[PDB]
Every structure is written in structure tokens, then in C-alpha cells.
């Protein structure tokens, strides 16, 4: 007897299922180390990362939500990205789209 | 991408399917339904999702909710589901899936810069109980019921006097002034009872013209015939309830006669088991009728090996009596009874009983009147086993009839359920906050109008907020202003419209009463049998349609020695 | 902890239980208050244990004779009741006459 | 029927003839007067008398009580009656026969449904008490004060500053304003005293239309000839008391000298001993004059071994003295004497001294002043016996003496005995019941403007409001804005006419003082005595008409051990 | 005639010349003007100078100060000297000469019948602190922090809510507005940041029309360059300024871009060290840009030898991080950094650092503010000697520099100097007393408003003050209406222009926030220094103008175990 | 002493604690409340004897085994916290997983 126990059926959740992903190598050219949230506009992180911020754009990651991936200085790795959703208007971050898409 | 459930479990609460035990009881419930789009569930902190263009959008204080709780499993008359709850204007605005439209997919709940987070990941969330048997012998009760997870109180009293010791009864206008001010003060919804024993109509309609939401007939001040035929005139020309404590003695008649003089008009029986009140041994057979709304006061909840014991000397106390009195120590023995004390459980279970209540220092404790309530339904689960309407395996049925005795009953019962009483959308947010492991027992946290009035709080001047020692303290919603605004002060209509709350100057939110007359047993939530019960004159037996009804007393019970230091 | 308003008035109780509990030790006629928080205290233990209430409104009886207390002390003590947490939840007991 | 006279007392309280021990003093009481009619008491409780169409008749609130205290025994300075006492919109009613008129006869205090009761069966009830000599040092002092029976206290201060440590002084506008808005928060009767040195009368007639209801003249801000006769001179045409602490270091003048500046104006002679201050060593001879109302702070009361002892640092502390500056230490040993100690309990017992009153923490306990009355009643019994004006063999004559001293006395020095002081119809509803066992020394209930404000109050959550830990809590009468309605501020009348209330927006009931300079010794209740006293220069023997006055020094106590913890 | 030294200081403090230890510190302050005329000091009580005619004139009120603080030993960071204080009207009349024109030379602060008088002699007097990194976790704070002498609150919170677990923000209209009639209930001056958090100005707008004086950044809620600059956008029209807590995470770019976004425009950096939170691993280099005015969480405050291992499990809770997800733990893990954290007390020696704050129950402690910026002056001169500024043989240099930190600086960074944050004349009267053993550890008074609010304060009972026990107490000051009189609630222009006060119903007096905008790094009181610092991205390593800047961790400082019971 | 309301507030924890230490001392199982109020007023007597935060975190996992506790009460406990005043100052102690 353990007060308040959880009894989890066992099995898995698909996370963010019917949605467009791409996957994009990414690589951490700055000297500091950098982390990136599960639902921050990709195509709008730190400069220093450096990928293909066109392919990301609209992507965020394709991670459980509220997790992160963190990218040491140097580090290169494989993302897998899923796009956004609602009205796939982007607003804030580095304000390079302000509005739709 | 893909996730384990145990994983899920531990970063977002459990999910459909899972089962979550309450507190240290063998009941267990089962979540029915998920609100969510799994991979778009919101959670704040540290690089998380509610952020500026990410989980929080760019609305206007207008377009969105001013809090917003995450990932709650809601446990609820009406279901046990996990959502995020969104909170407006001190009101539940709706039960779905939190969020920013922009970026994210079956938002319902709009998170904005205006927005507030409490994280409810892992804890159940309730509504805030509703306590209609309350003798306010002192203004302290109010901190124990509200801690206990209790946010709304009904009852009459005008402090420690011998009228109040005995009786829920805020005597006269002047009295009834007096404690409408005070209210102010408390950080509970508040609704007064008057004294309802007179023969004389304009007497009572006095009362319920300067702000009492219903009339409290009580034997000590006479629970004969003629009284109660006049309060129940007046309650039926002014939509207020009339509360029940029957005449023990027999003295104008017997329970049959009590009934004719109520003749089917809607009525609420305090402690019809009878130990704290009532025609003896048979008020409890009131539970057969249409009309009758029945309660239960807790200190015979759930039956126990020390009970009857301690049961006695109580009876003395509470109501003025005499122990060298042979006929006052006669008439309260002839109260309590091992019989109908049994039989109070099972008819809880049956739903024969459709509230439990506390009947605070008087014969009853304030804070125990949900802890109570579920130790009966463990009681009852580890005798009688599931329920004939449980469906799967888990106790959520027994939950929802249990839980509704305490919230959505009461609240209909005296004609509030418009403003309280269940998580709903346009109700108060009265709202209590558990760990599974101490549901029912120490919340987490209580809300009330939308405000935090009451949680455990640990060193002030530490670097966090829970080192030790952690103990329950007044929070901003229990301050002076935003108090106000985050309570209600029920009363009746002809109160309302007399003025009374500019006249008195009362400064909490106004809330008024109706639908008392038209109540009946078949509106009580999960709750409305009425069972063919009949009482042995001479044994006190209970018996439904001829089967005896009965129980065994408890040695050991959840909730108790594990989460109490004395 | 999470200690309700209840949980931290006992705590009240126990520190008074204290006072006496010393004062009895050194020899003290035990006055007014002394009795009451000592015998009370003795109580709520009695239920910690897990002794039944019907025990405890006995063995109350048996904390302080009337040679340990101050004189008049008995007579202003016609019963003692206290609240604790026993096995199966809170329950009252009331002591009789505890001084005698 | 017929029923023995012990059941009888055990069941309605003593009657006519029987004696009551006051707690665990020598002194006994003797009920002189009952006003039931035997067969036709009250009694509340489950089948007794106070029900509908029996106790209780079937008037509208106008036409009967709110609250009616049963079958009290009254001890005030007027008489030792049983009766029962009706309270009538915050205001003592009536004291005689409660119940309905319809079935019983004599009533004079009709019952009806707006009626709450409050039994006082075998309880005695006297006026709440009245402390003239009060240092706001800090808000505390209120609650102390209360709880053991105090509802009013008139005094001045702003907090713990140096000021406030030394005098009663509340400095001019600013600082009156911000307290009389402060005094709105505490449950007892306030009214503030200005600081009266000063030899501009603008500067006093500022204070007094500000709101202070008198002017403190102390000698740590110069109590010279110039400075009293321009605070009487302003006192004379604003209708305001003053209070006196004269010039212990003969500075300006003696005794002689001082008596001659106030001209035979009404003065109030705080601490008349001498050793909470005034001219040494004979500043006790004021007691002799028609004009002056003498009052003894209770460190002094009574005279017992310890003392002396405590007496030097305390006097230290208080006055901001150094005990390394030789004048600051020879100054502070020339106002204790055991001769003026000695004899100020004498002049007690004979009424030559007036008022008792604390000196709230400047040389004074504000919770002992009515247990310390009656301790020095006690000794006064045991060392002198029988009052000459005593009949029957009772103590009532001199519990009539002494209960004046901080009841009716200290209104009428003040101008305030047309609101409080004493239980006569019209009269502020504030009363004290005690159990004859802890009479003066713990209250069972204390009653402000007919509501309860505090009492001992046991486990909130308890089934009974007896069970431990039983202490004093604040009530409903203390809550917010029921507080500011059973509670008065008062004011001089000039600030009642300029609108003060209205300016500071003051919340609670106003009253105004009146009938200061009228008072003379000959009007003080039971304590009019104008001995020819004197006091020897070199031996500080106090004589009258020649005869040496002293007594001895108790080692023992009543109301002291067998009651506190601490 | 002719005293000596000695003699003089036991009697009215120190003057000129004298040196005096802080607490049991290593600092000593040296007398550096006196203002008095030897031979005419004034000194309050029995036979002493203030009385009638003497050293107490006779002025109407209106010509003389209602409360005077005689004797006063000033630190502030203009000066240390002593100095008679007068308070009218709740501010600062004036620092001179108190006395009688009349009979004395000098006297630039007259004293009359309406004045009250604080002794203090021996005493140390300073300017109320600020507290700008307020965490609204609790109610119970306020009391703590004003005991430890901080009079004035800047932050932003609901209450136990994850959102202000988190950060100090006050999310929108509807909980600003709540939150703004709950500050009337509160002791302290306060004033509330928003949400800062959106990149829709209208967004923001509304919550400062509502009521806020600035807008917290959190990158919780995400600090991300498009918020930063539409928060700035949106201050920089408003007149409220904006605290920042920078991107740790480094997730939408690297210190050098947030400076970027802010482009020049005023911020309030918090926690610029780091620990707290910020662009890992150099936040610090802030304190090197012009705009940039930068604070100290005190946690760190100063490095010792258990600071490390604290701050982890610390650093979770407090941002809701899971220790379990390895991105959670790494981001805690490079926040504390051993580097910084040495040379952040030697930036605090320098001046490059120019406030202290707590971030209250967030890694901060509420009531350690003063306390810990002193340890810090300690260690420093323990560890560096003397400042190149000192002149003399005397710390009172070092003394000014660090005072200023939660006084002036805080006061000037957030727009509200113009009220409080010295002892200047015109400027509220928040004051706070000292005994010089219990300098910067616990107070003798905390006056608010001119009124003391809290105080030591022993047995309620006692004949005397001082009797045990001796623990803080709320005095007049913190009640009701006198309270309302006392403090500020603090509203931008906006706010105060659309009426807010008026229709919230707010009943303290109101203040308004101005000159948010242009201050500048140049403005902080003795905390100037812009150095060119620079640091290591692997080694962590600060070094300004190429030198390592570091110190040694303490292993016993000075103000903990010999003062505090746990 | 001038108690600050900190200091104030630990006196309800070393209180607390008192009454767990008797019922450990009889021989009960300790139940929630007592084993957090036993092992917290355990490292505030470290801090004044001065121990080292580290020390600490380590020795109070060590105050009481599951098996002076009553069932789930170790699993009810994740962790324990409390500050007190080091030689160096107020530092907060976190003890993970106390009771094994
Ligand atoms: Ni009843
Ligand atoms: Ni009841
Ligand atoms: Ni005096
Ligand atoms: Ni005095
Ligand atoms: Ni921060
Ligand atoms: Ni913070």
C-alpha cells in the first residue's frame, strides 16, 4: 500500500501524430553551450547554431513538450522537426516573421 | 515523437486508463477521458512551452483567461477527466485544452500575457465543498473548514452563547445584521439560518427580510407542529429552505405526525440518523420521501469500535443537558443507537442519504466532513465491494456519488448551485488542489473566487517555499479588499431587494438564493433513493423492503494516524 | 508537514503538558491549569497508542491524586475531555472526577 | 411543587439568602434579592421553558430582547440580585422576569423568536471594567485588558516611544487623529489624552478640538504651577478631564503649592501613593480635598513581601533614569516608601481612594487591575474585619466599595458614566460573566454592545467547544465591522462638532464626554471619604486625625498561583 | 561646564571623533559632524530638559514637529553625523538642532505641546530599505522583511502559484488590480511589476494602465529579443522601468545579442552574477554598459564555504526543473559557477554592482537583505583593507557604498526616489533605529510614515517594556486606517491619470512612479564603475582590464550564530 | 532575545519534533508529520553544532529506516528541507529519499 500510487497501463503515447517532420543536421559553431525548447520557432534560434533555416521554418521540435536538446560548443546532431500548427502564425523570438507562415 | 506512459505519467499526470488510489483507501479511480492533443500539452518553467509566441499567444487581457490550470485530473459529479481548467473574472470559464492558437491545435483555452499558472500535473482537483450544518460558536471555524477544503458555510450562530451552543440559529434582525457584517471578514462563501420556531409568520418574515437564506427549526426552541407548519408557509412565499432537527421526545408527536405537518413540502433533515437530533429511534425513516432532502452530521461517519462510547458525555454538552437529570440522561440515551448508526453507512452507499455535513461543536467536526465522507465510501467498499452501477474495474461511480454529498447536493439543497458547488462553466472558482496522497486530507492548495485564499506554506525567509516547517497560512486571497471581491454573501431575495447589503454597507460580492421549494429527492445528484425503510419500535432494527440493513464497526481507518501529529 | 490549525493548537497542549510534566518531577502541588494540560496530554499519548476510549476515560482517573495537587484544585475539575486521533479517526473523551 | 434548596441552586443558581465564596478569597456574598417568581425561571435546552408558545411568545423583534442573559447573579455597585437581564439593540434593556407574557406572569422581558440566550444560571455578572490610566505602548495591550474583564480604556500614547514609555500623552493633531483612526481596530472603548503641558492654552485647545476627551499633566514634560493651571483653565471651558502626575522633585513647589495652583478645580490625581510619581513623600494627602478624585495604579495593590524589591528598577526603566547618575537614583528611592504603601490599601477599605486603575507598562499591569481590587479586599477583610457599614454577616458592603473603584468611578471621573460603568438600563451593553470559581481572575464570557468578543474557546475542530486546549480567542464582536459597531470612540464635544468622525472618517459609534468639572469626591460611589490625613516629613508615617495608618505585608495571595501557568 | 568623553558618549551618544563597531562586524563608522551645541542637547524624562517652558516651547502645531528622534547617530550615504531628526506630517521636516527658541540657541527643529519624542541616544538611525526583487509567494514576507528593517516592496505575484514560484510577475488587469487592494493590508510601501513577456505592445500597455510600475522580463515565460524589445518600446513611453532575467539557455542568442536588443534603452538587470538566472556564462558582463543598472540576489551574498552545495537542489524547485531530465539538471549545473559568484562581492567592493535584493522565496531570503550586503563589506575589507576612497582611520566610505545598495539605488532604479530611499527632507518618514551590537541584525523600531509599525516588544503584562519575552510585535502603525495613512501604494502615471485608486477603492495614499527612463549607470550612489570586464567561456574566469578578479569563500561570518535562536 | 518571526516560526519545529522524539522513544512507528518534524530538527542541530551542508545532506538519511516508520510514509517523503543559521550564515539542507 503506497498512499496516492499511480497504477500506468503499460504501452506508449505517439506524440504530435498526423503532422508534416523533417529531420536536419544541425551543429553548435558558438563557444557557449545552447538549448533549445520543444516548441521554439527553430528557424529562429541562437546564430550560432548553424542548419538550413529555410527547411526549419514554420518547425519547431519534434520532442515531448516541455523538454529540451542541448547543444555543447561544436556539437553536430541529428533533429527531427514537426511543423506548427493553429494558424501557423509566428510571433516573437528573433521577430523574423511577425505574422503568418 | 513517442513516449512511454510511465514517462507520460510522471511529466504530464496520468492519462486515460491509468488508475490513481485515493489518499490510503482502497478506492481507486480510473481516468475516463483526456482533453489534450498528446505532444501539445503545456507546462511552465524553464525553457517550457507556456512562452512568449510559443504556448502563450499575443491576445489582450480580453481574449484570455487570467489563470489557467495545467493538466488537472478534475474529479467531479460529472466525471473524473484530466484537462486544463482556464479561470476568468473569478469564474470557471472553461474545462479543455489550454494554449496558444497561433501555433498550436485545439486550443480552447487561450493563454495570454495576462495569464497566471498553477501547475496541476499530478494533483486532482475538486471543488470546493459546501458545509450546511454549521453553529458558528466562534469565527475560527471558518480557517479549519476553509484548510480542510471546504469553501462555502451554512449555518447560524451569533458566537459562544447557549443558543448557539445548542442550535444553528442567528436570532432577529439585529443579530442577523451584526453577522452579515462579520462575514466580511471570513474567507468563506457565508449564508445565514434564523430561528425558524414560531407561530407567528410575521416573525419569521422579519428575519428572512433582513437577509437569512433559510430557517432553522430546532427541538430546544420547540420543534412542534405549529412551528413548523408556519416556517415551512413562510419559506414557500420567500424561496428559502427550512433545515430540520425533530422533536426527540415525541412530546407533540411522533415522526408520522411530523411528516403529516410538513405535509410534502420540501424540507432538509439535519442527522437523520438521529443521534445528533430527531424523533426517537425512527427519524431516520424521513429518507422514504419525495420531499425530504436527508442529511448526515459527521461524528457517527463512518462506524467505528470507539463510537458509541464517545458518543454520551457529547450529547450532554452540546445540548444543555443535565446528567443527574434521570430524564435528561433517558432521553439522550434513547439517541444513540448501535442499530441506526450501522444502517447510516449502507444507506450513504445506497444513496439513500444525499449529504453529509459536520454539525461543527455540536455534536460534529468542522473540519472532517470530507475526510469523513470517504472514509464511509472505503468502509463501504471493503464490505459491500462495487456498487451495482460501477462500470470497469475502479471505484468512479462510488467516487462521484460520494463526492457529490458534499458539493453539488448541498449546493442545490439551499438553493446556491447557481453560483457553487461543482467545476462547471459560470460557477465561482472555488476550487481545491490535491496530492493523490493526501486527498480528502491536507490540499495543496484552496482557491476561492480565483484567488489563492489558504495553502501549506514552509520558513518565509527561506530561499524556497517549502523548507520546514510547513503549515497552513492566509494567503492574498484572504486579505482585506481582495477577500471581498472573492467571496459571497448569499441572501434572499426580499434581502437583496430591501437593500439590505447597502443599508448594513457590506463589502463582499452579493450572491442571493432560489430554487428551494423545488428541489426534491430525485434531484439530488447520485443520490435519490427512496427506500420502502422501516425501524423496529422495540429492537431499532432498519430494514429496507424487509432485508436488514446493517454494518460493522471499524478498528482501523484511512486518513487518520498516518497524516495527523496528534 | 503540512500541520493544520488543529495540529499546531495540540502543539499548545503538549508544551503546557511539559510545564507540569517538570514541575510534578520536582515536588510541585500542581495548581489550575498544571492538571489539566498534564492529565489531557496523558490522553491524546493514550490514543497515539492506540488505547480505546473507554480505556482512556478510566486510566485518566489515575494521572493526579488529590495529594498532588493544590488544595480546591479537585473541585474546580469536574471533568476533563480532549479530542486525539485515534486508529479509527478523532474521538472525545470525557474523564469524570480525574482528581481524587 | 416543592423542591430543596440545593437542587434548587444547582439547577438556577443560588437565590435569595444563600452565600457565594468570591474565587479563593475570604470574601462571601449574600443574595439579597430575587427577582423570579419561583416555578416560572427560564431555562434553555432540549424540553426546557424557553420554547415556542411556552418561554418564548409570538412578538416581532420590536416588542421583545435580543439576547437575555437567565437567572444571573448581579453583583454591582447598586445591589446583589439574582434576575435575569435583557439587552435591547446593543443597550442593557432591562433587568428583572424574562419570558412570554402569554402563559407567564411578572414578565418584564419579553422572549420572542429574535431573542438569543445566554445561560447565567450559577454565574455572576457585573459591568465590564473601566481602566483610566492607559499607555498605548503597543496595540497588544487590548486583548490583555479584555480578556481579563476590561471593556474600556482611556489613556494616551503613540506606540513604544520614549514619550509613551513615560507619560499618558497622545501629542497633538496629527498623532490624536492617527490613533483615534487605529482605535477602530481594537474591541475594547477608547478615549485619548492629550499632552495638558503646556502654558499656551491655544496649544491645549488644538489637542482638545482634535478629539482627546482630557489632557495629561506629567512631570517629565514639566508638571509646574504655570503648565496646570492652563490646562485646568482649558478643561474648565471644553468640558475634559485632567489627569495629574505631579513634581516628585518638589522642583517648582511642594504638595501645598501644587493643591494651590489647581484652585480647588476637579482634577484627577493618578497613583496618589507617590510611587508611580508625585511631590515626596506626601503627595497622598490630595486624598483630603473635595476637588480631587484619587486613583492607585496597581503595582502598589496590595502591599505584600516582594514589593519593595521590585519596586527601584521598575521605577528606573519606566522614567528613562540613570542608575549611575546619583540625583536620577536618590530621586527613584524617595518615592518608595513602605509607609504610603502600607497605608494606601487602608485608605482603600475606607473610601478615602476612589479608582484603581494599571498604568499599562509604566509601573502597572493592564491585566490586574480588578484582580489586584480584590486582592486588597481580601487582606483589608483578614486585617480589619467587618466594614463598619456592613450588615448581616456577608462581605456585600464592601464588594459594593470595591467593584466601584473600576466600574461606575472611573466613568464618572471621566465624564463617560452616561454610556458605561454599570448595569442600569440605557447603559452600553458590556458585561462579564464569571464562574464564582475564577471570579475576577479568568472571565467565562465578555460581552461588547451585546455581542461576545472573546471567551475561552476550546478545539475548533472538536464534536464540543469544551474540549482542550481551552484559551482566550477573539469572538465576532471583534470582527470587522461588528466590532466597529459594539464599540465606541470617544470624543471632546468641540471635536464631535467640528466633524472629526466624519473627517477621519471614522467606522465605529461615537460618543461624547460630559460632566468633568461637576465631579467632586462626594459623587464617587461608595468612596467619598475626605480624611484629614498627613504624612511626617522625616518618617513618612501617614496619620488621619492623628491615628497611624498601616498594615502588613502579605505572603500569600489569593487569584495568584492556583491559577496562572507562568 | 566641562564633561568628559566618556562621560558624554554613556549620556548622548557619540560625537565627533568617536568610532563605533558595527554589530560584531570589523567595520567601524567614525562621527563625522555634529550638529548640536554642547551644553544643549535635548534629553527626554524625569527632571530632564524636555518640559514645559525648557526644552518645549509654546507653539501652536503648526509651528513645531509632531515627532522628533533626539541624539541620532545618522548613516547614510551622504554622511554619518549626529543630529536631532524632526517628522511632520510623515515626513522628514528636518535634520538640526531640536529645541525651544525660546531659551535655546540653535534650534532648527522646535518642539512643542504636539511633539513626541523617540530617544536616540546611543542609538544609529538609517533610511528605510528597498526591495525591488520581490516574489509575492506570501503575505507573511511583508512582516519579515519589515522586521529586518526593509519599509519598501518591489515585485510582482499572485500568491503560491507556480507563474510566481517562478518569477515576480502580476499577470494582468484582473490580478493587478486584486493585488493592488491586497497591498492596503500590508505594513511596507509597495509596488507592483506586470508581465513583461509578449511582443504585442497593447499587451503590456494594459497592465501598466492597470496599475504596475514596471514589467518583468522572465525567461520562463521567454526572453527572447522580440519580447526584451517590446517591453523597452512600451516603458520608454510609459515611464516604468523593466527588470530583466536574461536567456540562460542561450536558446535565442548569447549575451552580447540581448545587449543588442535592448539597444542602449534603461534596464534593471537582475541577479547579474548569474546563479539566479541569465545567459550562461556571462551575464555579469551587464555591469560594464552605461544603460544597465545591476542587482545582487542575496543567496550568494557573500561567498562562503557552503554556498555551492546549497544552491542546486535550490535552483530546481524554484523553476519547477526535473532532476531526472539530464537537459533540466546540465542548465542548473552551468547557472552556478564558483568563478562568478568570488568575483561578484569583489564587484560589489568596487562599485561595478549598485543594489542587493532578496528574489524572496525564489533563491532569495526576504529578511536577509541588509544583513547579507553587510557580510559582504566585512569580508571585503577582511579580505582588500581599505577602499582607495577612505579617508581617516574609519570604514565610513565603505559604510556609504554599501548602504547605498538597498536605499538610494534601489530607489533612483525604480522611478520612486522622489519619496523614499534616504533621509533627506521632504522624503517619507521610513525610518529604522538601531542598538549598535544589532546593527543591520534586528532593529529597536521601524517607524513607516512617521508611526512606529514594529517593535521589539516584551510581556503585554509586564510593569515594564522590557520584561521577557522580547520578540517583534505590529504597533499602531500596521492598523487599519492608521496603516492606510502610513504607507504608499506606488502607480505609473497612467494609472494614477485613469483613476485606479478611485475605482479599486484603494484607501492608503498614493504615490507615483517618474524618472524610470533616464538613469543610468552614472546615477547610482557611490556605485558607478563601468570596468572592462571580460569572461572566460570555458574557464568561467572574470577578469577586468585583464586582472583575475576572485576572493576566498568564508567559513564564519559575523551577524549569524550569535544572534539568531535557530 | 527579539525573537524575528523566523525564528518564532522554528520554535513550532523543534516542537513538533519533541513529540515525535517520546513517540520514537516508546517504540512507535513514526507516521508523516513526525518523521519530518524528527529528521528536520536533526539538521538544525547539525547547523548550530556546525556541520557542514554537505555532512548534512549525507547524515540525515541516516535519522530513522523504513522500519521505524508506518507503511508509505518513506515513499510520502521524497525529500526533506530546512534552513538554519550555519557559522557562515543561513544555508538550506536538502536530504533526497531520507527514510530507507
Ligand atoms: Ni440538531
Ligand atoms: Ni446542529
Ligand atoms: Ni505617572
Ligand atoms: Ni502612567
Ligand atoms: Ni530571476
Ligand atoms: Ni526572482
Not at chain 1, 556539437?75 to 516573421?97: D, I, M, N, T
Not at chain 2, 437529570?325 to 440515551?333: K, L, P, R, S, T
Not at chain 3, 486510566?59 to 498532588?68: I, P
Request: charged share 20%.
Amino acid at each position: 500500500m503506497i498512499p496516492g500510487e499511480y497504477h500506468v497501463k503499460p504501452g506508449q503515447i505517439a506524440l504530435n501524430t498526423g503532422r508534416a517532420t523533417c529531420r536536419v543536421v544541425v551543429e553548435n559553431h558558438g563557444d557557449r553551450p545552447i538549448q533549445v525548447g520543444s516548441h521554439y520557432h527553430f528557424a529562429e534560434v541562437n546564430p550560432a547554431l548553424k542548419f538550413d533555416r529555410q527547411q526549419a521554418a514554420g518547425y519547431r521540435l519534434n520532442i515531448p513538450a516541455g523538454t529540451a536538446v542541448r547543444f555543447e560548443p561544436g556539437q553536430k546532431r541529428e533533429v527531427e522537426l514537426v511543423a506548427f500548427a493553429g494558424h501557423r502564425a509566428v510571433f516573437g523570438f528573433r521577430g523574423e516573421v511577425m505574422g503568418p507562415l | 515523437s513517442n513516449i512511454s506512459r510511465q514517462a507520460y505519467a510522471d511529466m504530464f499526470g496520468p492519462t486515460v486508463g491509468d488508475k490513481v488510489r485515493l489518499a490510503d483507501t482502497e478506492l481507486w479511480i480510473e481516468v475516463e477521458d483526456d482533453l489534450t492533443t498528446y505532444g501539445e500539452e503545456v507546462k511552465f518553467g524553464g525553457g517550457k512551452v507556456i512562452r512568449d509566441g510559443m504556448g502563450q499567444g499575443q491576445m489582450l487581457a480580453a481574449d484570455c483567461v487570467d489563470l489557467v490550470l495545467t493538466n488537472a485530473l478534475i474529479v467531479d459529479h460529472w466525471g473524473i477527466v484530466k484537462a486544463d481548467i482556464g479561470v476568468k473574472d473569478g469564474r470557471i470559464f472553461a474545462i479543455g485544452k489550454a494554449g496558444n492558437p497561433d501555433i498550436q491545435p485545439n486550443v480552447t483555452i487561450p493563454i495570454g500575457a495576462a495569464t497566471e499558472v498553477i501547475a496541476a500535473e499530478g494533483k486532482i482537483v475538486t471543488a470546493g465543498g459546501i458545509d450546511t450544518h454549521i453553529h458558528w460558536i466562534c469565527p475560527q471555524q471558518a480557517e479549519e473548514a476553509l484548510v480542510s477544503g471546504v469553501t462555502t458555510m451554512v449555518g447560524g450562530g451569533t458566537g459562544p452563547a447557549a443558543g448557539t451552543h445548542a442550535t444553528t440559529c442567528t436570532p432577529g434582525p439585529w443579530y442577523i445584521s451584526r453577522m452579515l457584517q462579520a462575514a466580511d471578514s471570513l474567507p468563506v462563501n457565508i449564508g445565514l439560518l434564523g430561528k425558524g420556531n414560531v407561530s407567528q409568520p410575521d416573525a419569521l418574515r422579519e428575519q428572512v427580510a433582513a437577509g437569512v437564506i433559510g430557517l432553522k427549526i430546532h427541538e430546544d426552541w420547540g420543534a412542534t407542529p405549529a412551528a413548523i407548519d408556519c416556517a415551512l408557509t413562510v419559506a414557500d412565499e420567500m424561496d428559502i429552505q427550512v433545515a430540520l432537527h425533530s422533536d426527540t421526545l415525541n412530546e407533540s408527536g411522533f415522526v408520522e405526525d411530523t411528516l403529516a405537518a410538513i405535509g410534502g413540502r420540501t424540507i432538509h433533515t439535519f442527522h437523520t440518523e438521529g443521534a445528533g437530533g430527531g424523533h426517537a429511534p425512527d427519524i431516520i425513516t424521513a429518507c422514504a420521501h419525495p420531499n425530504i432532502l436527508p442529511s448526515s452530521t459527521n461524528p457517527t461517519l463512518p462506524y467505528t469500535l470507539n463510537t458509541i462510547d464517545e458518543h454520551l458525555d457529547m450529547l450532554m454538552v452540546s445540548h444543555h443537558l443535565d446528567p443527574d437529570i434521570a430524564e435528561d440522561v433517558a432521553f439522550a440515551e434513547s439517541r444513540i443507537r448501535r442499530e441506526t448508526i450501522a444502517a447510516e453507512d449502507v444507506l450513504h452507499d445506497l444513496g439513500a442519504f444525499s449529504l453529509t455535513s459536520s454539525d461543527s461543536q455540536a455534536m460534529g467536526r468542522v473540519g472532517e466532513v470530507i475526510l469523513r465522507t470517504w472514509q464511509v465510501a472505503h468502509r463501504m467498499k471493503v464490505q459491500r465491494g462495487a456498487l451495482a452501477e460501477e462500470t470497469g474495474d475502479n471505484d468512479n461511480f462510488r467516487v462521484k456519488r460520494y463526492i457529490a454529498k458534499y458539493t453539488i447536493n448541498p449546493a442545490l439543497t439551499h438553493g446556491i448551485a447557481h453560483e457553487v458547488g461543482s467545476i462547471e462553466v459560470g460557477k465561482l472558482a472555488d476550487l481545491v488542489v490535491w496530492s493523490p496522497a493526501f486527498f480528502g486530507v491536507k490540499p495543496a492548495t484552496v482557491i476561492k473566487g480565483g484567488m489563492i485564499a489558504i495553502a501549506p506554506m514552509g520558513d518565509i525567509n527561506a530561499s524556497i517555499p517549502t523548507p520546514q516547517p510547513v503549515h497552513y497560512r492566509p494567503m492574498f486571497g484572504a486579505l482585506g479588499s481582495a477577500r471581498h471581491h472573492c467571496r459571497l454573501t448569499f441572501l434572499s431575495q426580499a434581502a437583496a431587494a430591501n437593500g439590505v447589503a447597502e443599508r448594513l454597507n457590506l463589502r463582499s460580492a452579493i450572491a442571493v438564493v432560489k430554487g428551494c421549494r423545488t428541489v426534491q429527492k430525485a434531484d439530488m445528484v447520485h443520490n435519490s433513493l427512496q427506500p420502502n425503510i422501516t425501524v423496529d419500535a422495540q429492537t431499532y432494527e432498519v430494514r429496507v423492503d424487509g432485508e436488514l440493513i446493517t454494518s460493522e464497526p471499524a478498528d482501523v481507518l484511512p486518513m487518520a494516524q498516518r497524516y495527523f501529529l496528534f | 508537514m503540512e500541520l493544520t490549525p488543529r495540529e499546531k493548537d495540540k502543539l499548545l497542549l503538549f508544551t503546557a503538558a511539559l510545564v507540569a510534566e517538570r514541575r510534578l518531577a520536582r515536588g510541585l502541588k500542581l495548581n489550575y491549569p498544571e492538571s489539566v494540560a498534564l492529565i489531557s496530554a496523558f490522553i491524546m499519548e493514550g490514543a497515539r497508542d492506540g488505547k480505546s476510549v473507554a480505556s482512556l476515560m478510566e486510566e485518566g482517573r489515575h494521572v493526579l491524586t488529590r495529594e498532588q495537587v493544590m488544595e480546591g484544585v479537585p473541585e474546580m475539575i469536574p471533568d476533563i475531555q480532549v479530542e486525539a486521533t485515534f486508529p479509527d479517526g478523532s474521538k472525545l473523551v470525557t474523564v469524570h472526577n480525574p482528581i481524587i
